[PDB]
Structure 1
């Protein structure tokens, strides 16, 4: 078929919502398992499938790379260069940093030389490149992203100046070097040093109102003994309205705290943890991979561009592109020179290719091979597309 309706994997990670995908999309969950991620793509660990027998989308692409992916993508990447997820964060998730291109090459090589299997838990670097990443809110979405302006951090730390000398040290000279030292010191707190700092913070949670104190309170219910409880004082806390997006830069701490979002990423990721985790953190390595530069709140959301019915979220990389398409009862053409995945965000989409018609209800998606572009879309609501602009 010109258009293939996707059968998609749901990862039942412990932190997933037992209800979100069901409430939003009618996805069946009689056993009430947590449903953390809905995967749309051709990841080797759990590829989407297409149908008349059921086959792996990854296997299908592999047998016909130029036709399915297009020449550009078959040339540059040799596979589907993106994985498209719905993320349902029912609990706050760990603070993460993605290393830059240079350090990714190094860490990938270190782990390869040490013989760490690629799918081992210990494995942090799975790509010799820095892989860019876009998050797009489906429901209101609470997250952290990047360091706040220094004067903001100063105001926020004053109520907890006594928690640790590193905090006092930073307040004395609020610069990048001392921000770095503060971040390392907080992460390295041990025993009674750590418990003292946490007791100061929790006392502050009784006499401070509103954000980011409220976010700290929320996080403390899941990570009551974590030095990452200080992080909303250092990192921008953001509440994305549905339809807003952020592009996560290298060397920049971020965390997803609550809500449902679409995420576009490469198949293989590099991740260093920076708090909100029971796992070991190599602090020197983390610190060597973080850029201690503020990012102003006005710069956090990616600014999309509307042209006709299309809203593009321009991304500073070749690997993938992301757009939203307003559906109308009159057809519009959606074309690209690559493979595309189309996902019904809301309303209902009818896709047409010549004589073939395919209906997607919210939460459903289709794969369109490069050879099959363009398709005509009509209906109501919005269709999200991941594809490649090359």
Structure 2
């Protein structure tokens, strides 16, 4: 069929919302499982599925038999597969701080782990691609997060109340530069026993005499990671609240975290992750440090600025891998065309999609796959349609 309603995986990771997807989209959850992620794509560990005409088949399997017709010649020749995973994330808990290594260091890490024969899907495994994979997050409900290091004077101002927590903090305050920020970071991560509890106790005292942000975020996080050096991170990293509709592109070598809410996320199937706190897992600190750019990002540069053309709101991404756009539906049809495969996801309202004689309804939280050889489709309705595709 021209258009293909997707049967999508729900990953029930422990940190998921028992309710969000049900509330938002009317997805059934009788057993009240935590629903962390809704997957839309062709990931080899849990592909989306389509219905033959009336049996269900893997979308990954269907692409593989029909690569050029389904992906477009461009995508088939650049990547050889669907180059994106599209997700709905429901953080009912705050998640680990993460860094994605750059291209050079990803190749090395990918090769190091492969030389040691670590299976691609082991917990030990941190590098699943030789490349640096980009990542876009797009807020569906108010979405709390950290992203990148704050401006140095901003960090100074935030550390003053906790100056006595660790000498590495005092060191930074004296000369607040990139180098000492690096030593401060590593030092917090490596605190042990009574050194760590000493620093935690200073921070806790502070929480009792400081108001608003990012103190309030630390208070929230501490309910889940009360014994984590990561509690110091909102003093170092930018605490952002995305409103519905806003987006952030996550650069390499830049610590970030998802703390609360529901969001769309676009990524590769395979990425590389170094953990930088808010985790019980062991961290290789020198490696982490070697993969971090200790460079402030001013607040005004956090959100990717969309570009509106007609009914199309594009979110420009400095990568060839995937593109992201939001389409305002109206009752009069507009044309949604691309040179590649595309996944269409109704954000809100309701979409009618038309292809010649075929028509297909998406209520909020539902998605269809459009093979390259089937563009364009006509869309009408109310609310908003989200599209992941490829511009090449």
Query: Take 2:179 and 2:156, find their aligned partners in 1: how far apart are those partners?
Result: 15
Query: Take 1:3 and 1:15, find their aligned partners in 2: how far apart are those partners?
Result: 33
**RMSD, aligned α-carbons:** 0.4
The alpha-carbon deviation at position 116 of structure 1 amounts to 0.2
The alpha-carbon deviation at position 27 of structure 1 amounts to 0.1
Cα deviation digits, residues 57-106 of structure 1 (max 9, x gap): 00000000000000000000000000000000000000000000000000
Query: Take 1:321 and 1:258, find their aligned partners in 2: how far apart are those partners?
Result: 24
Aligned counterparts, 1:128-207, within 5 A:
128-207=130-209
Q: Secondary structure at the match of 2:163?
A: helix
The alpha-carbon deviation at position 298 of structure 1 amounts to 0.3
The alpha-carbon deviation at position 214 of structure 1 amounts to 0.1
The alpha-carbon deviation at position 169 of structure 1 amounts to 0.1
Cα deviation digits, residues 355-383 of structure 1 (max 9, x gap): 00000000000000000000000000000
Q: Secondary structure at the match of 1:162?
A: coil
Query: Take 2:128 and 2:174, find their aligned partners in 1: how far apart are those partners?
Result: 40
Query: Take 1:317 and 1:359, find their aligned partners in 2: how far apart are those partners?
Result: 31
Cα deviation digits, residues 155-210 of structure 1 (max 9, x gap): 00000000000000000000000000000000000000000000000000000000
Cα deviation digits, residues 215-234 of structure 1 (max 9, x gap): 00000000000000000000
Relative to the length of structure 1, the TM-score reads 1.00
For 2:69, the equivalent position in structure 1 comes to: 67
The alpha-carbon deviation at position 28 of structure 1 amounts to 0.1
Question: Is 1:334 aligned with 2:336?
Answer: yes
Cα deviation digits, residues 288-333 of structure 1 (max 9, x gap): 0000000000000000000000000000000000000000000000
Q: Secondary structure at the match of 1:377?
A: strand
The alpha-carbon deviation at position 52 of structure 1 amounts to 1.5
What are structure 2's unaligned runs of at least 5 residues?
none
For 1:377, the equivalent position in structure 2 comes to: 379
Q: Secondary structure at the match of 1:163?
A: coil
Cα deviation digits, residues 205-260 of structure 1 (max 9, x gap): 00000000000000000000000000000000000000000000000000000000
Relative to the length of structure 2, the TM-score reads 0.99
Cα deviation digits, residues 109-157 of structure 1 (max 9, x gap): 0000000000000000000000000000000000000000000000000
Alignment length (residue pairs): 390
